């Protein structure tokens, strides 16, 4: 199977310093050329650089020359994207491409490794239950919950009763706070009966910062 | 250098229906347009090329035409893995520039969001900060406003939104909104209240509780 996994993406400080991988495999690398791209967070793409076979010329984008340099081993097969002095607007992830037949359209793609260009320092989150002061009923479905506040960077799983209850859930997408640190809740929605002998706990896991924790939801 | 136009920025319809879409741009490029399909996680892959070509593998009711400033992707009919954002992009000429997206959206019938408060745990209180949630869940169609009333009195600015994406079982959306003060401003005040306005249900909806010492 044509291959493209790139690699060397997480948290930087500006005006750090990133190297960059794409690792092509199922084909003849040494015959295309190849991009980076990048979309923002949550926003649209953009062109970054490319190459052509041999390596002999390259060619980047106004908001990423003299900075971002494209490069290439042909004998390990694997693109190389290095980064200098990295703006906050540097943020993103990053795809490699390669480009299809005899001009510029991009007819194979790699999954992505996400760029996170910051001041603000890892933090493991802290986690806060979701109990309803809601003491009554007979009101029909019944609510409860995961606050995941304060972490940095992105990404927090979240799930429940270790993988045993998937029904009803709703992990939310995180949200960048004033303070400059992501919080998401995850909540569970099931109908009153079950809840007599079932229980109810989060599993909160934060590999940036080794963090896993398991909040139970006391019930009432 | 050649913005590209994608209208609308979304689009809800049902599966089953045929979709079309529109991709503009500022001057001619004649045929160098090619068409990106982006399933929500996952990486973009290449739909149509040369504005007419399917690429292999791509199935037979995705369909590339126009030519010249103005063009269109259509989807015959409509299946659950159709629901996805779709890009397009010039290469007729430099530097390389994408439109800015459509989201196809499932139409749905109308649908009765349950709201839940949820009360700042004490483990929060001590740290000297307080979290109310409001839980607007299981709904359609996405618009939707939640309004926070403290002491029946009106909130702005201390509070962020969020929400899923349609959900692969019941195509419907869930909703966070989250209130932040800190344990001095919380504890000096008493009826903290959720009001959720929306299609779905008679007048606005207002769930409460209060500290209750």
């Known amino acids: 199977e044509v291959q493209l996994l790139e690699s060397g993406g997480g948290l930087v400080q500006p005006g750090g310093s990133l190297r960059l991988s794409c690792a092509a495999s199922?084909?003849?690398?040494?015959?295309?050329?190849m991009f980076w791209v990048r979309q923002a967070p949550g926003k649209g793409l953009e062109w970054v650089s490319w190459?052509?076979?041999?390596?002999?010329?390259?060619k980047y984008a106004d908001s990423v020359k003299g900075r971002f340099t494209i490069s290439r081993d042909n004998s390990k097969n694997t693109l190389y994207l290095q980064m200098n002095s990295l703006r906050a607007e540097d943020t993103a992830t990053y795809y490699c491409?390669?480009?299809?037949?005899?001009?510029?359209?991009?007819?194979?793609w790699g999954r992505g490794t996400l760029v996170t260009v910051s001041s603000a320092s890892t933090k493991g989150p802290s986690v806060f239950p979701l109990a309803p002061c809601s003491r009554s009923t007979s009101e029909s479905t019944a609510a409860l919950g995961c606050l995941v506040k304060d972490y940095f960077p992105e990404p927090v799983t979240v799930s429940w009763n270790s993988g045993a209850l998937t029904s009803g859930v709703h992990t939310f997408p995180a949200v960048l706070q004033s303070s400059g640190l992501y919080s998401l809740s995850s909540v569970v929605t099931v109908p009153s009966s079950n809840f007599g002998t079932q229980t109810y706990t989060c599993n909160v896991d934060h590999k940036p910062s080794n963090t896993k924790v398991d909040k139970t939801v006391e019930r009432k | 250098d050649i913005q590209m136009t994608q209208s609308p920025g979304t689009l809800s319809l049902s599966p089953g229906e045929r979709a079309t879409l529109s991709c503009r741009a500022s001057?001619?490029?004649?045929?160098?347009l090619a068409w990106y399909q982006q399933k929500p996680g996952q990486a973009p892959r290449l739909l149509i090329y040369?504005?007419?070509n399917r690429a292999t593998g791509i199935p037979a009711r995705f369909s590339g035409s126009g030519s010249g400033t103005e063009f269109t992707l259509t989807i015959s009919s409509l299946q659950s893995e159709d629901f996805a954002v779709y890009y397009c992009?010039?290469?007729?000429?430099?530097?390389?520039?994408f439109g800015g997206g459509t989201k196809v959206e499932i139409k749905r019938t109308v649908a009765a969001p349950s709201v839940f408060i949820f009360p700042p745990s004490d483990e929060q209180l001590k740290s000297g900060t307080a979290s109310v949630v409001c839980l607007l869940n299981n709904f359609y169609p996405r618009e939707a406003k939640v309004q926070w009333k403290v002491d029946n009195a009106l909130q702005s600015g201390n509070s962020q939104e969020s929400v899923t994406e349609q959900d692969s079982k019941d195509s419907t959306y869930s909703l966070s909104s989250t209130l932040t003060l800190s344990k001095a401003d919380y504890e000096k005040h008493k009826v903290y209240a959720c009001e959720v306005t929306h299609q779905g249900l008679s007048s606005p909806v207002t769930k409460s509780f209060n500290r209750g010492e």
């Open positions: 491409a390669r480009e299809g037949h005899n001009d510029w359209y991009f007819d194979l």
């Open positions: 199922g084909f003849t690398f040494s015959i295309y050329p």
């Open positions: 190459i052509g076979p041999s390596g002999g010329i390259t």
């Open positions: 001057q001619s490029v004649s045929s160098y």
């Open positions: 040369d504005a007419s």
């Open positions: 992009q010039q290469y007729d000429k430099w530097p390389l520039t």
